[PDB]
Design a protein around this nucleic acid. Sequence first.
RNA 1: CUUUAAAUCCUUUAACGAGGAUCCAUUGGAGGGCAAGUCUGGUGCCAGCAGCCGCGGUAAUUCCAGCUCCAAUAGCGUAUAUUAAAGUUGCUGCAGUUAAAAAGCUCGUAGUUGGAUCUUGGGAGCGGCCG
Lengths: 221, 185, 83, 141
Amino acid sequence: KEWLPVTKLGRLVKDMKIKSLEEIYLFSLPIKESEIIDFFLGASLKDEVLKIMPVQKQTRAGQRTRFKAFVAIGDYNGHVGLGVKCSKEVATAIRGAIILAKLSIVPVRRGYWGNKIGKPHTVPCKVTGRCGSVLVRLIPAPRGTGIVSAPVPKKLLMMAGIDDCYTSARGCTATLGNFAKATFDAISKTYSYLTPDLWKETVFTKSPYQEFTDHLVKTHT
Amino acid sequence: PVARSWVCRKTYVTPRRPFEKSRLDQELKLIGEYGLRNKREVWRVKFTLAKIRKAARELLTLDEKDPRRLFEGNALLRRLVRIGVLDEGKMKLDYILGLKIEDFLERRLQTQVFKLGLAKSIHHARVLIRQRHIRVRKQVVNIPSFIVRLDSQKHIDFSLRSPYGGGRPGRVKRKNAKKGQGGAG
Amino acid sequence: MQNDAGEFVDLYVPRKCSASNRIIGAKDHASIQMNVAEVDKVTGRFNGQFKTYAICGAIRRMGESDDSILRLAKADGIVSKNF
Amino acid sequence: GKCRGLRTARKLRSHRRDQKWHDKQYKKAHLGTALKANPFGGASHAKGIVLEKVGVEAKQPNSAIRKCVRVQLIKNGKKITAFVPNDGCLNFIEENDEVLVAGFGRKGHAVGDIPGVRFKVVKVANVSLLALYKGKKERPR
RNA sequence: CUUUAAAUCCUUUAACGAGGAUCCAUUGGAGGGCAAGUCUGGUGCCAGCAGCCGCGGUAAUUCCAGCUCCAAUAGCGUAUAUUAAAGUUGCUGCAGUUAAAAAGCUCGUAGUUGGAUCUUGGGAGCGGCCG
């Protein structure tokens, strides 16, 4: 019932020395330990399962079927995630999908539509994401229009905190896993787009390794 | 060749998806909260709000320092103020898009009678509108689909032809008194 | 990101690549924050402050990272002019 | 497009006309032979008389004999095979009776598991089959 | 009473007019799409259901009937033309090696398209180079 860290990241976030995961995003630190999100993100995080798809092998002695679980995670004002797990037992499939969805969590930013008033509500620019043949487009919308899409990017954008979108899907949309991965790749390219906002040459702060090496030289070996 | 009008429009619209959980549950929550008869009323209010939002978007797609855009935006702002849904603190064209369907449904006469303390229940308020009991500015209203304007809110009272606010007693009281007097004599 | 109230409503500011002038993503785990020490101005020691750079992943996939570090150290004031 | 100059329009109109004529549904909707081959002739419903009541077999994966009524039309005079929709409603339709024949829904095509029969029956002897099913009226003798 | 060339339409107003309101709210469905039962009896590839996949072969979450149930509800369902969905007519905005699809190749009249270059700069002055 008590979490024991393995890597230095878990020890640094457990010894109340790392303030938040914002500088973990800033320094692009590879997250691989599951409950960093559980220590940082509080009770606002919720979860819901998209689809369960059975896949079958073929053998001389019958066929073997294993569950494939798709899950979508994220608090309603903040970040998102996605997890694909394949196992024979459905409960282990859901548990592994939950763990992988807590692992792959990306930060997103929101812009305005025309007027720069209040809190941001929509995507800053036209972003896109592709995998297979699925092509998911995102267009910014005025405030209060609501997201106009299929039900699964509707629930993804409601756990993304973005209230206004316009979509344009192409290709075979009937594969739900590929479509979910395509809109996840579309929402993951929000920060990978240069704007005149981010034309400032940023300053360099102290790295967590460079400031906590005096602690981790004696904490664990 | 006849002297006829032939000017009719559809006020309610139907959504494309017939069966989805979120819209049906939210519309049912609105119906239960505000005492609506059916989903046609909330569809009508949603269509009016959508028309107002479309007019607001068609005004924000025009530039500033234009007389037509300024006149239409000012007139829309005065109308939205005068129907009592908005406050005078934030009176600008960009705040028109930040309105909800409960904001429009709060200015309904049924919810107003329920919230003024002159009615006990929401369904009782709807009955009291339909039972021809109250009046506004010496004029009775029998229709719950009424938008109460801001300058006429303190002039709501029971009608003079109603037994609740002073008038002739109803049919049940005289029938019961006549039955009791016939039984006694 | 700006606002009419003069407040930074953006939650965090990502860093910038010093060789491609791009934005480093959070999932891009090939980004390198090289630290380069400086020698003391008197004889040979280390002064104490740190001089750092940054680079994106696609440059290291293509390969032109050593030249980028060479020009950054040359224009910064580490490598001599003749080299 | 491919012809993308500033002063080319008639080539685009001719190519769009040819490629629209190469479509199938527009060719079915804009040629006289498809409307001529249709027995209804643009009519949603058509009345007719009954000459024989012969059932037909089903398709491969199911095995049933759903009985059908062969109805000669009045507006044209051609032999048309209809199909009684409901169960226990064959006995209401007898020989030389007046029926109303309408399609089933697949734009004038064979449907489900009945080969070669495309239309259905809604009324017989100026009363609907649903009234005879639900016991709301009676057959006029 | 009022209205109308007099009524019938509406409004107003005396007298009656509900407690199982019997003064009766109907129409398709309940495997998926698609909101809604592993309820109960009947025939058990027959009768049939089903727009598509399919459900019926002696324990049917689909056939025929009772209760419950879900949708708009004085309205609901079916047929047939038509539009959005259709980025399956693609001007915005399709595809042409393998899923349908580059003429055997070349010349060539109409048609479409077509390289660069020809006038810069200034001052008075509203001011702490320029709107």
